[PDB]
Design a protein around this ligand. Structure first.
Ligand SMILES: Nc1ncnc2c1ncn2[C@H]1C[C@H](O)[C@@H](COP(=O)(O)NP(=O)(O)OP(=O)(O)O)O1
Ligand SMILES: [Mn+2]
Ligand SMILES: [Mn+2]
Length: 425
DNA sequence: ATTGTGACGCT
DNA sequence: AGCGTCAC
């Protein structure tokens, strides 16, 4: 009753760019704007692999991981932008820099946790407190929430329904209680409208957002009304939302763990999890996972918004599928040097921008016929940003996998170099 | 012949 | 440290 914490202490937002790589290319090339278009990597094998898809193209069924020739079968007028190639591999620099633009804007409002190249979590608790004290008791107008949906409303034209649900929400707000969680979420949604307006004005990129009490609910909310809209998921809306929500839709339950939850417990939806005790869930899935599941099916999650805007690792990877697998010493050396050269460029830029230096170099390889995505992962010291030294060290670390008696056997299907363990510089 | 990343957990 | 899981 009174002593049961409800997970309503924080206001957390998740902001995620709409078809991000496509928007980057459309800003650069106006001919692609408001068109079915996609961003692809490489071009020889089946027109290239698709990695981003505009919503106009999604209406025809084009998806990520689709080959471009098959997408053209679905959408003959599909326009394509190619990822930059450098040193024989895809180079994502343009998208990382656009990401930095977005992150730097978001950092002006509150402390963000970079969750991916195109999304970040925001802890807005202090911001909502300050804004509530500054309001001094005046109500919140629907004009301050022009693109916000309230999940589970209305109850009892899409824009008409959105406005109806918003009016229902706002008419029920207790604006004199500065401690009301629903009011806090609402003021958070106002701040998030402002953040998304600033992002669009200063970059041209549109984004969606979720506003709730934790990271999981914020991300789930963000996905509900994409694109170019934001969604507030309140504590009280959790029972209904979760009553038909497949378990796999919740962050971290999309893989084998969610499948085991479904199979062992004989359930399909998130809300059904409430029928089990914490001890039962711990017995089936471990203490940490069990506590997490017991709280999460009730809308409660405590994972903090970490103050980390920069990545922790800088990596360079290339696959060599099929008959292109590396089978000679010279091939492995040359590709290790290409990877190390891109890595050195990015590492020097990172040192100059962020006042830090990586100290450990991770080398990973996949070998042909091996079932696992990574066949070997070994680390060595990273003492200077030199591509020749880094590639030589990677070769020294991996050379005992060659079972040949000039040749390389069995052939390598993936190379991977990663700089980690940063220290202030 | 989804590719190229990046974070975090387990032992 | 090296391997595995998960998303993005
Ligand atoms: N599997 C993958 N492989 C390579 N690049 C990928 C990728 N998945 C995503 N990217 C790249 C391309 C993506 O543009 C970008 C952000 O990933 P999302 O947010 O998951 N997808 P998007 O922003 O496109 O659309 P929306 O959020 O509106 O549904 O990262
Ligand atoms: Mn996105
Ligand atoms: Mn994303």
């Amino acid at each position: 009753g009174p002593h049961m914490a409800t997970g309503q202490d924080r206001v957390v937002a998740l902001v995620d760019m709409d078809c991000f790589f496509v928007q980057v290319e459309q800003r650069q090339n106006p001919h692609l704007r408001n068109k079915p278009c996609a961003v692809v990597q490489y071009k020889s094998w089946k027109g290239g692999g698709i990695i981003a898809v505009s919503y106009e193209a999604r209406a025809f069924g084009v998806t990520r991981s689709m080959w471009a020739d098959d997408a053209k079968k679905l959408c003959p007028d599909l326009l394509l932008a190619q990822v930059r190639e450098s040193r024989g591999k895809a180079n994502l620099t343009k998208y990382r820099e656009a990401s930095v633009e977005v992150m730097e804007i978001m950092s002006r409002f509150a402390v963000i946790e970079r969750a991916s190249i195109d999304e970040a979590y925001v802890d807005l608790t202090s911001a909502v407190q300050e804004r509530l004290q500054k309001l001094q008791g005046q109500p919140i107008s629907a004009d301050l929430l022009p693109s916000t949906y309230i999940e589970g409303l209305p109850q009892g034209q899409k824009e008409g329904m959105r406005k109806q649900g918003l009016f229902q929400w706002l008419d029920s707000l207790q604006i004199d209680n500065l401690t009301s969680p629903d009011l806090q979420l609402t003021v958070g949604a106002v701040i998030v409208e402002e953040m998304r307006a600033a992002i669009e004005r200063e970059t041209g990129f549109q984004c969606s957002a979720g506003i709730s009490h934790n990271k999981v609910l914020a991300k789930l909310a963000c996905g509900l009304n994409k694109p170019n809209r934001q969604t507030l998921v309140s504590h009280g809306s959790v029972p209904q939302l979760f009553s038909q929500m497949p378990i796999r839709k919740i962050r971290s339950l999309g893989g084998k763990l969610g499948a085991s939850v479904i199979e062992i417990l004989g359930i399909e939806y998130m809300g059904e999890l409430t029928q089990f005790t914490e001890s039962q869930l711990q017995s089936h899935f471990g203490e940490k996972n069990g506590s997490w599941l017991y709280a999460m099916c009730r809308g409660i999650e405590h994972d903090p918004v970490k103050p980390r805007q920069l990545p922790k690792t800088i990596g360079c990877s290339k696959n060599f599928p099929g008959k292109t697998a590396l089978a000679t010493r010279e091939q492995v050396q040359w590709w290790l040097l290409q990877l190390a050269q891109e890595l050195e460029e990015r590492l020097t830029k990172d040192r100059n921008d962020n006042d830090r230096v990586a100290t450990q170099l991770v080398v990973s390889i996949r070998v042909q016929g091996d079932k696992r995505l990574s066949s070997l992962r070994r680390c060595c010291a990273l003492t200077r940003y030199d591509a020749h030294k880094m590639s030589h060290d990677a070769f020294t670390v991996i050379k005992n996998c060659n079972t040949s008696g000039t040749e390389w056997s069995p052939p390598l299907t993936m190379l991977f170099l990663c700089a980690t363990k940063f220290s202030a510089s």
